[PDB]
Every structure is written in C-alpha cells, then in structure tokens.
Chain A
Amino acid sequence: AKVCYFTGRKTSSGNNRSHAMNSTKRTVKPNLQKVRVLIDGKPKKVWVSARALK
C-alpha cells in the first residue's frame, strides 16, 4: 500500500548484488496491515505498519 497512517513508512528502492556485484534495481516495500481502529471514536480502516503495533 501507499503509506502508514501513523508514521511515515513508504516504498523505496535499492540495488541487489549477487556473488559478483552485478547491480540491478529492486523495491523495498514496508510491511503494512489493514486494521480497523478508532479515530475520533469513529472506527476507520487504514494501513498501519507492524512496527507501531505495540
């Protein structure tokens, strides 16, 4: 998904070397989860990372 509603994790990109550093491109998406949570008392549905779930 796009972002986290609470913090600002977002997708990005970096290379990927393999045993002879042939450089290509990759994607690093942040772990994300859809959960129903309270906002103003109105339960929403939104993306929250699995690192702000403690």
Chain B
Amino acid sequence: ELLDVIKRPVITEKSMLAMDEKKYTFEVDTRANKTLVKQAVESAFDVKVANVNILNVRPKFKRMGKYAGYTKKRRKAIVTLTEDSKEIQ
C-alpha cells in the first residue's frame, strides 16, 4: 500500500507560491507518519530529502434542506526538495 499514501495535490493561491521555492502540497491520507511520505515521494518521483511538513484539518457544515452535515477530514503535505523538479502539473 506504499502507493496510496498520497491522494492528490493542493492547488491554491498559497500553494502556487511555494511552487517557487520547490515546495509542493499534496493531500495525504490520514494515519501516515512523515517518514512514510518521504519514502512514497522518493519512490514515485525520483526526488530527494529536505524534510516534509504535515497538518490536520477540522470539518465544517452545510445547510441544504434542513440537512446539517459535516465534511471529511484532511491532511495536507508540504514537501521540500534539494535538487530536482516536478514538471507534472
């Protein structure tokens, strides 16, 4: 299962900035340590070290028809490189 840690990349006004210092942002599935994501990226993209960062998120609400329901959790992943690029987006 060391390929379904990373889920997809975050594309935001903020994230787009970090693209200008070799810093990328993915959604990592919950229950994954840092080192796991290190391994996953290195083994999926031919890139390197410069320790990752990680987060957590709360849910929110929504009101459609008297229907109050939350949304999923999250876990961002903000990765830093040393020498190579990702011309993948």
Q: Does A touch B (CB under 8 Å) in the complex?
A: no
